[PDB]
């Protein structure tokens, strides 16, 4: 949004950052699964 | 398959698809975001 | 975009620069052909 600012005109200069919050919000219900389940999976698989 | 590849001892330099990344237009940066996120996901693969 | 700024109103002040990236993007698949093929063409034709 800073290096290309002169390419969006008030719309969707709000939409481009509108989807960033979407990406953020979606990251959590996955990172939870990852860092709470896959962790022990690897901690085992790294010993067989 | 990927998660299994994570710990499978790598014996062949993997590659990634040839793909018409567009320069100029502020979409390329999304393609940078794609693989930086991927790298966060899988350090063991990207390392090669 | 600087000498006439008071002639576009937030639209397409983003479109005017929107097409510049198009021109850029289109220049490459031609400049490649030019500077990789026509070069030797001239380097020959300049000797007949």
Automatic annotation (TrEMBL), chains A, C:
* Origin superkingdom: Viruses
Please give the name of this protein.
Major capsid protein
Q: What organism does the record attribute this protein to?
A: Fako virus
């Amino acid at each position: 949004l800073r290096a290309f600012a002169s390419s969006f005109a008030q719309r969707p200069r709000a939409g481009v950052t509108q989807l960033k919050s979407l990406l953020t919000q979606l990251a959590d219900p996955l990172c939870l699964a990852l860092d709470g389940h896959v962790y022990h999976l690897y901690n085992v698989m790294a010993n067989m | 398959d990927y998660f299994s590849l994570e710990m499978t001892p790598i014996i062949m330099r993997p590659k990634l698809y040839d793909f018409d990344m567009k320069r100029g237009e502020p979409v390329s940066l999304l393609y940078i975001l794609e693989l930086i996120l991927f790298s966060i996901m899988f350090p063991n693969v990207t390392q090669h």
